[PDB]
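User: We ran a pulldown and think these components assemble together. Before we commit to crystallization trials, I'd like a predicted model of the whole complex to look at. Sequences follow.
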Amino acid sequence: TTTLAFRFQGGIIVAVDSRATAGNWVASQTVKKVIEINPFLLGTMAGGAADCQFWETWLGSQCRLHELREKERISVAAASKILSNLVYQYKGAGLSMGTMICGYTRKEGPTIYYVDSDGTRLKGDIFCVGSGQTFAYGVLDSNYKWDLSVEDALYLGKRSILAAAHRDAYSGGSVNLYHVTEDGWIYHGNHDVGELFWKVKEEEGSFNNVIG
Amino acid sequence: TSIMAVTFKDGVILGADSRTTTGAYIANRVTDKLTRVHDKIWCCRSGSAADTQAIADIVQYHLELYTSQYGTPSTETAASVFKELCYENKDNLTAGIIVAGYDDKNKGEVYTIPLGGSVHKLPYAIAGSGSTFIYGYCDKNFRENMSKEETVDFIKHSLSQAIKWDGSSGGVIRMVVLTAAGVERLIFYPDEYEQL
Amino acid sequence: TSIMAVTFKDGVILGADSRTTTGAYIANRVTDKLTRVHDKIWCCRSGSAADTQAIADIVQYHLELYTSQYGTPSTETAASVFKELCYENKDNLTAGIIVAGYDDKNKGEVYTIPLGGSVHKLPYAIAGSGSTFIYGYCDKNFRENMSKEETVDFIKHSLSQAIKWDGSSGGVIRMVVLTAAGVERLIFYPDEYEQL
Amino acid sequence: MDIILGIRVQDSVILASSKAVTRGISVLKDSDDKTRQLSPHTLMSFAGEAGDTVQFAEYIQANIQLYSIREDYELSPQAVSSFVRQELAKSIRSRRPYQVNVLIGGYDKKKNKPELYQIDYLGTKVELPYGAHGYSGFYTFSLLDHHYRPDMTTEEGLDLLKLCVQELEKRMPMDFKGVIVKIVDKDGIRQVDDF
Amino acid sequence: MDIILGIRVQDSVILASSKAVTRGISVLKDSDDKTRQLSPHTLMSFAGEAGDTVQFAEYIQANIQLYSIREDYELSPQAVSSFVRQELAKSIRSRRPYQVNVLIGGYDKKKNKPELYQIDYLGTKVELPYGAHGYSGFYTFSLLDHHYRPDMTTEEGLDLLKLCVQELEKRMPMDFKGVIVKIVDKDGIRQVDDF
Amino acid sequence: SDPSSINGGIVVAMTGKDCVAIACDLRLGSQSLGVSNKFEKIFHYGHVFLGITGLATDVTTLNEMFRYKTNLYKLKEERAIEPETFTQLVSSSLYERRFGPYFVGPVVAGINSKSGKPFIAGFDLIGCIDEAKDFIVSGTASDQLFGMCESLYEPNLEPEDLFETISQALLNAADRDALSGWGAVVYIIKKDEVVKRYLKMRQD
Amino acid sequence: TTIVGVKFNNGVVIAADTRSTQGPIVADKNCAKLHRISPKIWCAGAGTAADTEAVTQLIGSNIELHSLYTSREPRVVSALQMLKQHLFKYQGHIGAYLIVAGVDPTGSHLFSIHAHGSTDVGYYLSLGSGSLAAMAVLESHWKQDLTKEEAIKLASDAIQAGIWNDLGSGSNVDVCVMEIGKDAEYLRNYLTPNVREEKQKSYKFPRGTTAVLKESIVNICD
Amino acid sequence: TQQPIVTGTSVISMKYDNGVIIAADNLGSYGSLLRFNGVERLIPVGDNTVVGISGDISDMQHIERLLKDLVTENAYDNPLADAEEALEPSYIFEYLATVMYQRRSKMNPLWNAIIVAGVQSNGDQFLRYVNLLGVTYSSPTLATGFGAHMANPLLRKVVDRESDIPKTTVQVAEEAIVNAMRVLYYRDARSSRNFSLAIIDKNTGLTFKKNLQVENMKWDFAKDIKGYGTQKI
Amino acid sequence: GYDRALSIFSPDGHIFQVEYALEAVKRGTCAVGVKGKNCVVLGCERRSTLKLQDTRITPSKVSKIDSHVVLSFSGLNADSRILIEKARVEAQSHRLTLEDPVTVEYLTRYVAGVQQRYTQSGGVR
Amino acid sequence: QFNPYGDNGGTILGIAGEDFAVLAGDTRNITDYSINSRYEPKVFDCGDNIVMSANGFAADGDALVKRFKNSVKWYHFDHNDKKLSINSAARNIQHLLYGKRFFPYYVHTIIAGLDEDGKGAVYSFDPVGSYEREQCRAGGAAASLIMPFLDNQVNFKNQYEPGTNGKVKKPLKYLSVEEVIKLVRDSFTSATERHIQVGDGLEILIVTKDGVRKEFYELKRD
Amino acid sequence: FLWX
Amino acid sequence: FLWX
Amino acid sequence: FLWX
Amino acid sequence: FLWX
Ligand SMILES: [Mg+2]
Ligand SMILES: [Mg+2]
Ligand SMILES: [Mg+2]
Ligand SMILES: [Mg+2]
Ligand SMILES: [Mg+2]
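Assistant: Here's a predicted model for the assembly, 2016 residues in total across the polymer chains.
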């Protein structure tokens, strides 16, 4: 799996692949690795499919109970720390989860938290998580600026997953794009790597390693 | 260890060797492996000395409390209590026990309880490491409704062979006779049984 | 497996069960475990079927070449060749072999060769998994200078018990009689020996 | 040993190789050249097990130098790579195999073409426009997939390489103390002193 | 986590803590603060197992902050260190022990003296003029044995610390992405922004 | 550390009406890392075609070994080796390394020049011959290829139809395997012409 | 795999199934497990497919050279001795389980050989994963003084037991009849009781369905 | 986590037109030692069910006690205990199946393979299998241990599918079972000659047969077997 | 454990133990809260029947729960300590999990929740 | 040591149409190389127009189906006989599976039915309860054989419009119940040929708004 | 068990 | 390997 | 691994 | 560890 989330002038970009594997068997190419917790909160999934899917769905229930009890949308910090405190209780039991909690609130602004199953919780501007994280980092880091336009940032996020989808055997299927603004998350479509690769290769003139 | 119990006309006889071993060292050469759980219910102990003593002590306790409330327990009842302990704690016990008793209704009865904790009612039973060597001999020689002198000879000759071939068996041959007459202890020394 | 050889007045008799097993499956129920290495030198094979066949084939080769040069080999010579192979290759062989032969000078002779590769000359020998159950019976019943009919009964009754108690032994009881008269093959079926 | 990169451009092959030699919790040296010149127009970078790397490199170097003297002729990069692969392919089924991974950058004077060969310790040979060994590939391959063009100049190739070293210095856990860069072209082998 | 140093000088305690957070072959972050303020004049740096480090630090922070509110009084550095040791000493014989090593730098306002405590995950406490955790000690202890004087100023202490970071950047295998430096004195805790 | 599934890759061969087809993917990787998208697994010695899946160092070594052997064969026999004979040579050569084998799944394909009969065969790493009328499969997605071939295949397909069937068999099998794909090549083999086609497939 | 040998009055018959497996996958639905050591000595093999084929060909080759050297038709006991000595030498590492049968100047013979080099004599034998299914049928129906037509029926019935009840065995029944004073007749696919039913649909694709990047003529000629 | 000590071997069974047959030998093995020769491994529950048990005998004796206790409990406050509310084979099986799966799930299994043979109140044949893992399956023929490998092939030649059951008589079915028991005696090294057989018929009811013996055995051909190849004497 | 239901309903629908607790509050020294435009002020009465007191060490009537919230009270002094301690712990627990100090409403809602629990828990007044 | 898991083999297959859905499974139950049953159904009507199969370890499979059937019963009791929607069933099963996260159910689960818009739905689950709605899913031993065929024939993967230069894909369209049953029957006959744990019989459960219909077809018994 |  |  |  |  390859998931990235990075922060820029125009908000947060979240991009994920859609591949699920059982060793070298490709189980699915149509997996939703982004959970929409609420209109201003996104969760990314990497590692154990069941572990991520169950606990990030559960996190959504805890975030709903918070806004019922406190009459106020939960902070990204508090939401991330519910999940990090949960997995820390299971530490050593063998949960496998690599997760980014991405969202906007008034008090915080655009915020990204990395949370994994050994209990690590980090705030940061750029994260790539999954088997293909290094491939995504390579393209993302070498092209990343704070002053990217919403159009350019969306493309760089999409191009960084495509990069990993290509090289990493355990990443691919399609790219799912999200843009998080002060007004909440906006879905920017499902992009099949089948068509996207050839479209990018032709238009960009990249991927010269491949027989055109 | 070599232990056996044989039913006959007048009741039942229990026989055993007298040797306890750690490795190839004989820790005790005059062991009493024939132990009383009730006036006319006795058992032969094989396997772990610690485990068999702990089990026998508990069974004696249960049958003493049984006797206080419901009078003399059957040999079947005694075997059932042994089984219950052996079966329910099979993971933590190494105890092969032969239960032998004399009722006045049921006469002589023998129950064998192997490692599993299963119960088997038999005309006679053999157990312990030395038993392997006398399956052939005991099967060919055992008859039902033997006399006391015949049964004593059968046990003496049987354990004599078991002791001869098994390094883990040796010393004296102890026997316990259970009849209407009462309880009789018998002992046979090497100088007698070796040259049978 | 259950195998034995017994010396008597007129020579020696070899007996064996007929069962070959992989685990608890009986691969062959009519196995011939009595094998000729010379006209009047035979052996009983126990342990690995592959190992015992390879050894027996080599010994037969050595004694055939011995006969070509120095005439009929002694039973002791045959046992010595078996020992040499078993001892020098002890790390790679699982073979318990009983060597039995008839000279006219030495009469009936039995040599047993356990796993170690050691040689033991005995009046009679028993080996294989089933032998454990008949040590007691065989020791009590064996006499020296028995008749042919007595020795055939002794072997039949002995292997009958071994077969009864050992899962690894079964099928028919094969026997081979070695006397001055010559070589006689005997077979006994379950319907006969089971109800002894 | 750890980081060895290779980029074939229009008219040359560029090999970048990390300078760090680490043993335990000590960087023993920060100026190590992980390369041998096999012939005037063929360069081999190497990474893997300590001792094995240099022993294997110098053994290959000696054999190619012997061939050069005997025939008074320089073996093609394709020929050298095929020889090196076969040595490793023998090695892997030896008592103690060479645990050495190599890049072979050469300029074929007959074809007037740069050639880059990537060979692992099993004897797995591939001709590539760009290659890497160890963990370096996990960053550099996706980066080069994007930025690499086949008609680039040596100067463009060096800028593309700077982009790789910057990415590795950012995201690699270990300090590899920068790289020694060497260019293989029609005029032979020369070292970039300021990188 | 990896590098945490501490130097007690005349009038202050200085804690240096590496900024790198590495998992696998990826440096995830290069700006991580491996410290919590327990009280206005007590700072604790921490290094060890992922998750355990922050969970343990914040747990101690919460308990010291609770004591401060209850008694309207700041616990002495000696008192805080004794509390932290006992928590680790309990931990080590737990089902899953905290694998966290800590330095506690504090200024005792009653004694007008800086104090540095080194505590490992077993609950082994020592007061030191200078301390380190992990492999850092193998370089810094011998260096400080030489260059350290007990009557040094905060500026001298920072130069002595620069000498340690330079030595670690030279000889340590891993890139720890520099250090965050914090001073604990009579005026409380402040961070040096340019190091 | 399973030699047969480090590099990855697949080969499939099919028979048609007076024709044979052999196809392979182009991926060479080091487990998760894709390294080369040009690594062909099908070679030919005269009119006999050999595809080899498994450990890539052995794929290269065996190709070089069979080129060597078929070259000496031709010099001594004064004729090109036939598929049936080459099959026996492959089997001999693999079983020579019985207790130290090449970690490969070779596939022979070609038309006997004398009889004109289409011929395909497969082997295990130890040299056991698997002869088939219909199709042979090999590699990391052999399960997938068995499923595709057993459903899609019908006898006596024309060269142009057989091309579609083998291509769809390889493509759909490769897309369900992580270590296979990254491009594909299909050889259509008639009595005295051979067409080689590179397929367009998803590059993940 | 299921292989059997059955003796009758004037000869011996061996039969086998035609399934080859790689783990749970059927590699070959119609492979030949019946091998000719010599014209009138045939071999049925179970275990490692290459090992049974290689050991069969090697002894078959050496038996042909021995036959030419001695100017005599080869004997089953010769094939048996050479096989068991070879298999013993490799301490079971050559995983060949064989039923050796044939007719020679001495008469008709039926033996089994295990990978470790043990040999067994019998009137009926079975080896392989389906040996217990086959041996059940043989133990139920076998009698002394079988005819040719009875022995073929018994042998094929014993294989069928393996085909149906054993997952290791399947497809067809190969038979070889070795009768004294006659040529051995090899009956390849004697029974074919597992014919694939007509498919519901033709999956013949419309021409041009597959996307193509490049075409080129390959040069096979000199 | 157990290891079985005293064990019983194959239990074999099949359906016929009117009911079911089940059989099992009377041996309690102690590894390779054929220790106990008087062991009954068929346990009738009422007049319409027989439970055949293989595996550990101590665990078998425990299951005996559970079934004995089930009959007692069923009779409690039950005027129709010997009529409409009598224990069915399906009830007895589902109880055992529940226990077996609960014990495997607690990592402390009853080390047994169990076949429940009986006739339901509506005259339907009941035959179903359960083992130490709690795995259950039904088939016209069922067998445990060596029986699965050697008995089933022979019994499936009589009843190959459902449609063959009405065509199979009790004479034909019993003959097949008795033949299978002989084959198992030839080839299973932990089997005995002595066995028990039970027929549950929807007309004649439960017929329990004790002290049966394998007979009409072929051993004569053994006399002709000499050596392992070359030996002629 | 002591289980008795001490707080129960009376026929007229009153819980006398809760109403008698209010009488204890009415007995307690006066406490006043006045919130201005940019501040809150807590005023507290201290009864003057106690001279020879030590005002340095005597528990102060206004308690800090956190650095930004205070709690004054009227009624049983010993009871107040238990509420203050619980509130102070919940204040630190909130900072630890929400990474933000409590609101005054949240801290109030917690203290109120504790008081309520003791009106329908067995064995407690 | 006691191993609490086993493999009972077999394979299952779910396809979703426009106004219907099918869940097919072979009726063979095996352990190792032995056939336990030739007809042991593992595709169950659970009520509320939901069909379910849990293929793998039959004991864990039966346990799960039993618990879900029981879950449906209590949903009716607790929510005024409300119909359990296929999406709601799927989420309930996730919680059942994930409940045993640290001692898993060793089964692959597929449910089929109609969504609340009356359109065909298939949901598939991993052993610990990760789930996903799909048009298409094979599960069990022969999943790796069948799934790529379904990709090609149901979702028309790698199929381009003839003469469009591999630029225009073959358009997605719903299949008729007649066309879907053809693909199921061909999928299973193909799987039976090449997988030893698949055969004996095929049982299909078809779900329309009218209810749950069954169809049975013979498969090869070798 | 799937992984992502 | 392929088995038979 | 035939035994006797 | 005494046995009997
Ligand atoms: Mg990929
Ligand atoms: Mg026996
Ligand atoms: Mg310390
Ligand atoms: Mg792929
Ligand atoms: Mg099949």
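Chains K and G do not touch (no CB pair under 8 Å). That may be worth checking against your pulldown data before setting up trials.

User: Thanks, that helps.
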